[PDB]
């Protein structure tokens, strides 16, 4: 206390720089302050979410605003197709006459910034048309911002704050989350669908001042309480339909085609609607089934306790779990990531082969960035999950009251779940380097036709079963007299079959040998990054070469050099090294996605087709051959467009090189030289009479990896954007 | 057809279901489940104001218990499965043999 | 000011005293073995963490364990 | 009496932060002496990280196998 | 065919690639004397290339739209001889292998100090016990049936 | 002899021998039968 | 004993009727489990030999096969037919609701029951002959109901691969079938096509 940080008395008195520097790196770890209890934990948590919430709505809310104020969202839905989405507008002193004059495009006064995140075609499609809808939607955003700080402050205060108890009652947060967070949302965003998003795709504008006034169907709610329900999908939307008027328009407000848009090549907004009243019908459902204070319903640990099987396999089964969830942070946490980071990876997965917003498939580069964007926020979304496991073994595990249960039968048994999946992991690599490295050779011999091709046979069998009728399986969906197809012939299958099979999108791309192995080669980033993550989660607690782990904390430097050396031998260095792995696991899955796309976009899959089996192909006809652009961005004759990109490419080659540094030289050599550093400066004639307060110091050794890992995460990061964006923009195709 | 009909005589069926079918074994297993608690104590004796069971509309007059939040129960299921027929019957959907 | 604690299954084997670069650690009076020695720790304010005694127990596990803790400038092998 | 696994015996491990823990190793010698807390002493194949193959355990700590 | 595949003997890109590489290698041929050791060495070459391409034809691989073959693997009986019947000898190698060294390293395990017979291989005792990887899909079932293959006590 | 023995079966001079040997049976099996990508006599 | 010269399970004794040791899985090895399995069974082998006299002697008469008679409830306009006539309440909501009721009512009570020897052999209403009166002459009958059971539950699924087998036929004329020409007509153009 008495000075920064007042959360720690032990970092207040620490004379060096490193108070500083820890404390900002321990604002947040609320468990570890001093004079810490119960409700004052939960309380701090509960006014952080309230903070997150606020500053969200001000992000999305500048990002309206922006669009609305220097954008160009007049001008891109008279023409959506020719014509570039503007971000915001450039204003910087240190432009050149010749930047000033590359970077004004669009059709704007001035250097602006064309949108990659895809808002415009997101707002084109919900039913956003002028800027006066961008600028109301922004005052409706901040006034919300403000209302989320308004709510935390007053929780924040006595006599409002809820205690421990009320945080700890899972069963009615669930049933209010299910029906009301995720049900009633869900069924709200179909109201919108129906009232204004359908209505505005077909040249109708509905609005607060009309709405009241506009049936959005000729037999409004007639049908619905009858439970004719039919009603409302007897005129759906013809194929000859531009979107945005009423040209071969429909009155259908909810269908099940399946298919796409003919000219915007995305979801029928019908089929959304639909989709969206559905899932909140099964929602609401759905969250009535825990005990409030009715009398009737569920109590989750009693389910719990009663899921336990004869025989003894199991241990005592799960008896014990809800005590340990619901009094444990940190396994919340940790599950909540993981189910993010899954959902997260299949939005990713879902947006390119499934898009729902109109004109965004012809939009290339908005397309490699959203996907790019999703799965390296989704790989980061599960090495946190792990991370936070691990982190709950450290601290909130009880191994007495765990006795014998699923959790602890887990870390009983740790060393052959290790051992196995290392296998595994070495199996897969052993393999898929052995094959890339044999095609790569048998390609330097000259003599491509004795490669190792293997067909992703059973990818095919799954395509086939789906419809896709290019390898000829005859199977499910592509037969013609399996009950499967026959059931579904009248509903959906006709606009499902005629998108799958059409090879100009995204829905199930025709797969081969190259395929296979770099399927192969993510199964081996999966299997090794969990390899790590799941080794540093079991042995946290403590091993052979340091059993009395747990008593140091989830993060420490080492153990000293005894017993052999123990560097690296904590759960965050677990963590630490996980990190790697994944950004090389996503690496290689955004470079097989960009690859895939960027020669399908060109009308020249084959090309890919040769050139993915071996790895010269991957360096040579990827890397090499689709960097020309970008590196021209700016060269001694002059700049164009691209330079702002070609300089953030270098700018990530920078920020990861020196990530080297801090991940290769450790601190016994720059403490040394402070130290010479700090004689000369105390040494020196009229600096002197300057004295430091802070006695410089080294980085600590934990804050020294944290701090090249998070080097060699920007520049990867910065460098991989700057390429793909430069590259799929250069071309636009 | 008549969605008076078929929603009237689906939630009194329902109705009738719970209150002399169903009642029993509804009743057994909501005891031996008994109320949600954490830490052995229920969520209103661990301090929880708002976790109190409200006893006052619970009671009923019914001989067996037969109470206003079941009816509640029974009649949503009776309406869900009314609704799920009028809506399936009148969709005109038909699979092929 | 790091903690440095002595565990019962010490043997007075006396290594660790040998091995502290600072004099944190002694031998006092016991008699729970053969040596009727113990490890004690009165000077752990002058402990810079270096867990050089920890290096010399032969005993599994230690019988001498450092946890670091707050730093000092004793702490911080910091002359200047 | 004697106290504890004979000499020469086999015993194995069951402190749970030894090297050799569910191991198996050769009692050396068990002292007499009361008032000392491990006596027995247990001579094994295999180093640990330390380079050490011998090490004193409590009563409790060692059972005598086959 | 299989997976819209075609068989290489009927194969169109495939002949193609073949008479391509032909050229490529008979290229270099003309500019040397007709009977020197580097004219003999590149015809032996294309003689080499030639029997590749026929053979290939014959086993009837499955080529695709780049001409190259590819390798069935899901275990379709005309296909066997790909990745299967390969699958099974490397097996009862490895095991060979693996079994092999296992009981050099049970056999070893009873002396006073077996890593001498470790960094020093025995070769003696080696010889006799190579010979044991013949039979060993058989040693290996009975000595799991007889339950001592995994190490029971831990 | 005896000690010539010895040291001509310590790991790394056994190893390279029976790698050598390998290497010249795959050798001589690519060599008779090459560019081998599939087992056709059954 | 059903394999002779295989060891006993020591839980499976014997005097259970029916028992003849049966039990590679272990499944009954905790006794509470197997009064469930054992009530289990006595309601699955009574169904089986309910249906299976039902799955026949319709298709002996001149209507269709087991498949063929359930088939009119997948038409728009679905109406059934019993022994040639076509019945009024035919139409698929209506057999749907009154059959779900009917043994659901049925269903709970009786599952209301804690003997648990009326669980399997309740009696009374439902024993009106009185053939329960000599407690050993009662095992014996214990003993055929539990046989007929097996065997019946053993030609259902039989039937059921036949049907899978060769569909849109039925086990007697599959049986017709295989008298025409036993031995170029069986089960091996099944197995070895
Ligand atoms: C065509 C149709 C007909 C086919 C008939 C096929 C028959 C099998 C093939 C060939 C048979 C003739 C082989 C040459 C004759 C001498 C083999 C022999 O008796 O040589 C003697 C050895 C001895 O066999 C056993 O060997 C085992 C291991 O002993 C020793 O093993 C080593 C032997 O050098 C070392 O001495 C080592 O210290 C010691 O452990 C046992 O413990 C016993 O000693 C002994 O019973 O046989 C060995 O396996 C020597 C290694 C070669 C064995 C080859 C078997 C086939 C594969
Ligand atoms: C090109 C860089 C590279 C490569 C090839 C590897 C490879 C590997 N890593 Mg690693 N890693 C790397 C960078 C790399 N890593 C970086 C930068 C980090 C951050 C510090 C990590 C951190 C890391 C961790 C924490 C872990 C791994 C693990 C593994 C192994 C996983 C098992 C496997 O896939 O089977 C084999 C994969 C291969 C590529 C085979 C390599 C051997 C081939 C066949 C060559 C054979 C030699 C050949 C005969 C030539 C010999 C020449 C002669 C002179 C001797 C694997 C060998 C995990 C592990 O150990 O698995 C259990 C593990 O836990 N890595
Ligand atoms: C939370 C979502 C939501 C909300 C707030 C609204 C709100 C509204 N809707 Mg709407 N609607 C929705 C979802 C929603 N709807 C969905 C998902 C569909 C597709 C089936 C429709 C289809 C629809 C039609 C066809 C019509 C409306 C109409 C209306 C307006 C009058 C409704 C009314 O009072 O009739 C009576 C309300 C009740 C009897 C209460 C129902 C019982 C509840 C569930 C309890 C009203 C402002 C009507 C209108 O004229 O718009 C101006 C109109 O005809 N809606
Ligand atoms: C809802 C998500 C969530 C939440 C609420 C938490 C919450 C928490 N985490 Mg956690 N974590 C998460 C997700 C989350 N995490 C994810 C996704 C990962 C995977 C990367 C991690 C990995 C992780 C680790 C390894 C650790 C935690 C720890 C913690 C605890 C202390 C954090 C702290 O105060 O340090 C202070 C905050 C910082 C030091 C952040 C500043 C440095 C960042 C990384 C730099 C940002 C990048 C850079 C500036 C951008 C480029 C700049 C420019 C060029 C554009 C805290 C309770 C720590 C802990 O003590 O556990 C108990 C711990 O060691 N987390
Ligand atoms: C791209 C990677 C990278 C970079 C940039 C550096 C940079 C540096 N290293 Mg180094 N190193 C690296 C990788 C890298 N290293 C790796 C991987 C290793 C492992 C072997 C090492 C190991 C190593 C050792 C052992 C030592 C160094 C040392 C140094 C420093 C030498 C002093 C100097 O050059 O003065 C000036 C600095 C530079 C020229 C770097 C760029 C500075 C830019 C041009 C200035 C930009 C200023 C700009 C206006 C800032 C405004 C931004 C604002 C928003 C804050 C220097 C900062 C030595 C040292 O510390 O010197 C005493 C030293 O002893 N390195
Ligand atoms: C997992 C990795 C992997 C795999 C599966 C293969 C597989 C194959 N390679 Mg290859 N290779 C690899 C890695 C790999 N390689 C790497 C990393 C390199 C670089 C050094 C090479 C370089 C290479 C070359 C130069 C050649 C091959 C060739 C071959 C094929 C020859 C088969 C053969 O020798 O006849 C059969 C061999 C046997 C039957 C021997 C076993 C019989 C025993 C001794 C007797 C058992 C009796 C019972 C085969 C399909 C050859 C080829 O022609 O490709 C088509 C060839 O020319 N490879
Ligand atoms: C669901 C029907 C059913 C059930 C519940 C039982 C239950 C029982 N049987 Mg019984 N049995 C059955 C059918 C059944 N049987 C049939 C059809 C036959 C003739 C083949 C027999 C022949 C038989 C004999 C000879 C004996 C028993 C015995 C027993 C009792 C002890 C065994 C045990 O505990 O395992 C419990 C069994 C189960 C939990 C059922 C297992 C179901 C699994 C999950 C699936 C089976 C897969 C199956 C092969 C699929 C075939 C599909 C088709 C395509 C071929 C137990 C109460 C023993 C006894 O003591 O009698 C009192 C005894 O000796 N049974
Ligand atoms: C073809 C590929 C499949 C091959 C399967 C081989 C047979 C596997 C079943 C028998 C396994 C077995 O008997 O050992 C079973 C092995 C141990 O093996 C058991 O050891 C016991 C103690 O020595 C007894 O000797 C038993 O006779 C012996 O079977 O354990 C297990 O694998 C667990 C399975 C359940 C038992
Ligand atoms: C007095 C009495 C009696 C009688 C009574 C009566 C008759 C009454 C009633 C009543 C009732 C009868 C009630 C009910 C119900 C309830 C409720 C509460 C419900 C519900 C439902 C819902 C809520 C739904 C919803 C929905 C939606 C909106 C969506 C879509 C559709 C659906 C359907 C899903 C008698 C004489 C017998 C005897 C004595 C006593
Ligand atoms: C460490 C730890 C942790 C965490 C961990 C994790 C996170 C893990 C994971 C994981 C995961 C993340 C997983 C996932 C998964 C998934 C799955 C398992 C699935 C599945 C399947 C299915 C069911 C399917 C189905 C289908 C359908 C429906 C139809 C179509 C087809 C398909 C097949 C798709 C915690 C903190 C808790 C605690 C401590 C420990
Ligand atoms: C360079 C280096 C140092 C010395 C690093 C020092 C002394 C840091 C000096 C940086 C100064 C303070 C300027 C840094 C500018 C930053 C961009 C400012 C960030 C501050 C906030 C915005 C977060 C270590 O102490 C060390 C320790 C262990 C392993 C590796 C290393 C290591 O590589
Ligand atoms: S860590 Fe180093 S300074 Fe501290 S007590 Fe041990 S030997 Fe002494
Ligand atoms: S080194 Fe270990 S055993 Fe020896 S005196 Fe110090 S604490 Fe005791």
């Known amino acids: 206390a008495l000075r920064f940080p007042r959360f720690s008395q032990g970092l207040a008195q620490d004379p060096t720089t490193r108070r500083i520097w820890f404390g900002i790196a321990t604002a947040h770890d609320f468990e570890s302050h001093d004079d810490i209890t119960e409700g004052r934990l939960y309380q701090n948590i509960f006014a952080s979410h309230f903070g997150q919430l606020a500053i969200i709505f001000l992000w999305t809310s500048g990002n309206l605003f922006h669009v609305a104020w220097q954008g160009n969202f007049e001008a891109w839905v008279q023409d959506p197709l020719h014509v570039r989405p503007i971000a915001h507008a450039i204003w910087d002193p240190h432009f050149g006459q010749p930047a000033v004059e590359a970077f004004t495009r669009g059709g704007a006064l001035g250097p602006v910034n064309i949108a990659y995140s895809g808002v415009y075609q997101w707002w084109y499609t919900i039913g956003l048309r002028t800027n006066e809808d961008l600028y109301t939607g922004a005052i409706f955003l901040l006034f919300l911002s403000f209302i989320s700080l308004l709510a935390g402050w007053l929780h924040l205060q006595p006599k409002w704050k809820p205690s421990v108890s009320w945080f700890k009652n899972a069963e009615s947060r669930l049933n209010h989350h299910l029906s009301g967070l995720f049900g009633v949302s869900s069924l709200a965003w179909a109201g919108h669908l129906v009232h204004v998003a359908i209505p505005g795709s077909r040249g109708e504008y509905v609005r607060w001042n009309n709405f009241l006034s506009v049936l959005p169907h000729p037999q409004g709610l007639g049908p619905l309480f009858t439970g004719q329900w039919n009603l409302y999908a007897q005129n759906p939307d013809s194929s000859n339909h531009l979107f945005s008027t009423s040209q071969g328009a429909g009155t259908a407000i909810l269908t099940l085609l399946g298919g796409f848009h003919p000219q915007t090549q995305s979801l029928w907004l019908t089929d959304m609607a639909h989709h969206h009243l559905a899932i909140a019908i099964l929602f609401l459902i759905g969250g009535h089934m825990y005990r409030t204070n009715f009398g009737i319903g569920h109590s989750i640990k009693y389910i719990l306790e009663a899921h336990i099987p004869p025989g003894g396999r199991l241990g005592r089964g799960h008896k014990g779990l809800y005590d340990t969830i619901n009094n444990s942070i940190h396994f919340q946490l940790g599950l909540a990531l993981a189910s993010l980071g899954v959902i997260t990876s299949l939005v990713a997965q879902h947006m390119y082969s499934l898009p729902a917003y109109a004109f965004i498939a012809q939009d290339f580069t908005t397309q490699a960035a959203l996907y790019t964007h999703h799965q390296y926020i989704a790989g980061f979304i599960m090495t946190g999950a792990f991370a936070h496991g691990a982190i709950f073994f450290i601290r909130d595990y009880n191994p007495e009251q765990n006795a014998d249960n699923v959790l602890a039968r887990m870390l009983e048994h740790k060393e052959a779940i290790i051992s196995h999946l290392s296998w595994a992991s070495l199996f897969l690599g052993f393999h898929t380097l052995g094959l890339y490295v044999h095609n790569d050779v048998m390609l330097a011999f000259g003599t491509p036709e004795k490669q190792i091709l293997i067909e992703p046979i059973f990818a095919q069998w799954i395509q086939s079963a789906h419809g896709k009728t290019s390898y000829g399986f005859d199977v499910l969906l592509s037969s013609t007299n399996s009950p499967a197809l026959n059931a579904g012939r009248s509903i959906w299958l006709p606009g499902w079959l005629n998108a799958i099979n059409e090879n100009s999108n995204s829905l199930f791309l025709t797969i081969g040998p190259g395929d296979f192995l770099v399927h192969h080669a993510i199964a081996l980033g999966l299997h090794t990054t969990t390899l790590i993550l799941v080794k540093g989660a079991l042995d946290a607690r403590g091993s052979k070469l340091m059993p009395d782990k747990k008593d140091f904390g989830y993060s420490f430097p080492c153990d000293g050099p005894g017993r052999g050396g123990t560097c690296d031998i904590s759960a965050w260095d677990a963590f630490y090294l996980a990190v790697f792995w994944m950004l090389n696991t996503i690496g290689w899955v955004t470079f097989y996605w960009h690859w895939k796309h960027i020669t399908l976009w060109q009308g020249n899959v084959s090309q890919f087709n040769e050139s993915s089996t071996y790895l010269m192909g991957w360096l040579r006809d990827y890397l090499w051959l689709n960097s020309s652009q970008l590196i021209n961005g700016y060269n001694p004759f002059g700049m164009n467009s691209l330079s702002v990109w070609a300089w953030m490419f270098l700018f990530g080659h920078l920020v990861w090189a020196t990530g080297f540094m801090f991940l290769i030289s450790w601190r016994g050599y720059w403490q040394e030289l402070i130290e010479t550093l700090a004689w000369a400066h105390e040494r020196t004639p009229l600096a002197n009479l300057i004295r430091w307060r802070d006695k410089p110091v080294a980085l600590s050794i934990v804050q020294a990896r944290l701090v090249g890992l998070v080097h060699f995460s920007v520049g990867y990061i910065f460098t991989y954007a700057a390429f793909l964006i430069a590259s799929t923009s250069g071309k636009f195709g | 057809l008549n969605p008076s009909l078929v929603i009237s005589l689906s939630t009194g069926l329902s109705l009738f279901l719970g209150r002399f079918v169903f009642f029993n074994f509804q009743r057994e297993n909501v005891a031996k489940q008994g109320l949600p608690e954490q830490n052995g104590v229920t969520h209103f004796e661990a301090g929880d104001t708002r976790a109190k069971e409200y006893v006052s509309l619970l009671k009923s007059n019914d001989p067996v218990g037969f109470n206003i939040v079941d009816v509640l129960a029974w009649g949503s299921i009776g309406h869900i499965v009314a609704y799920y027929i009028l809506a399936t019957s009148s969709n005109g959907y038909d699979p092929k043999f | 000011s790091h903690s440095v604690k002595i565990y019962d299954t010490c043997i007075g084997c006396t290594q660790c005293v040998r091995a502290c670069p600072t004099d944190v650690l002694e031998m006092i009076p016991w008699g729970g073995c053969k040596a009727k020695q113990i490890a004690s720790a009165p000077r752990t304010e002058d402990c810079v963490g270096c867990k050089r005694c920890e290096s010399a127990c032969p005993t599994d596990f230690l019988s001498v364990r450092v946890y670091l803790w707050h730093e000092t400038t004793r702490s911080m092998g910091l002359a200047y | 009496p004697p106290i504890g696994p004979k000499r020469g015996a086999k015993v194995k491990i069951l402190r749970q932060e030894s090297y050799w823990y569910k191991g198996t190793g050769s009692v050396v010698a068990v002292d007499q002496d009361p008032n000392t807390r491990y006596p027995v002493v247990v001579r094994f194949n295999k180093v640990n990280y330390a380079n050490v193959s011998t090490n004193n355990y409590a009563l409790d700590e060692v059972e005598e196998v086959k | 065919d299989i997976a819209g595949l075609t068989p290489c003997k009927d194969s169109k890109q495939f002949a193609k690639r073949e008479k391509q590489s032909i050229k490529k290698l008979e290229s270099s041929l003309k500019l040397y004397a007709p009977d020197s050791a580097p004219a003999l060495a590149i015809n032996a070459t294309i003689e080499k290339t030639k029997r590749r391409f026929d053979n290939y034809g014959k086993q009837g691989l499955l080529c695709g739209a780049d001409g190259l073959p590819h390798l069935i693997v899901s275990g379709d009986q005309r296909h066997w001889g790909e990745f299967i019947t390969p699958g099974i000898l490397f097996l009862y190698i490895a095991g060979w292998i693996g079994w092999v060294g296992r009981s050099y390293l049970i056999a070893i395990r009873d002396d006073k100090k077996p890593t001498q017979k470790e960094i020093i291989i025995d070769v003696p005792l080696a010889t006799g016990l190579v010979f044991r990887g013949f039979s060993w899909p058989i040693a290996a079932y009975r000595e799991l049936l007889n339950g001592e293959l995994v190490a029971k006590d831990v | ?42 | 004993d059903w394999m002779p010269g295989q060891p006993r399970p020591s839980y499976l004794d014997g005097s259970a009727p029916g028992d003849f040791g049966f039990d590679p899985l272990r499944l009954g090895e905790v006794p509470e489990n197997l009064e469930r399995f054992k009530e289990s069974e006595l309601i699955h082998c009574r169904w089986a030999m309910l249906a299976v006299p039902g799955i026949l002697v319709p298709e002996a008469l001149g209507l269709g096969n087991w498949v063929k008679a359930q088939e009119w409830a997948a038409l728009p306009g679905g109406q059934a037919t019993y022994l040639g006539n076509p019945v009024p309440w035919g139409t698929l909501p209506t057999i749907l609701v009154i059959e779900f009721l009917s043994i659901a009512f049925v269903e709970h009570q009786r599952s209301m029951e804690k003997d648990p020897e009326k669980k399997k052999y309740p009696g009374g209403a439902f024993d009106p002959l009185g053939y329960s009166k000599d407690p050993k002459k009662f095992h014996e009958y214990k003993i055929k109901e539990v046989k007929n059971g097996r065997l019946a539950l053993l030609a259902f699924v039989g039937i059921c691969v036949q049907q899978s087998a060769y569909p849109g036929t039925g086990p007697l004329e599959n049986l017709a079938t295989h008298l025409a020409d036993p031995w170029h007509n069986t089960i091996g153009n099944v197995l070895i096509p």
Do not use: C, H, Q
């Open chain 6, 1 to 42: 002899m005896r000690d010539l023995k010895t040291y001509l079966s310590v790991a790394p001079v056994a190893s390279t021998l029976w790698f050598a040997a390998l290497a010249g049976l795959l050798i001589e099996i690519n060599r008779f039968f090459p560019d081998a990508l599939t087992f056709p006599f059954f």
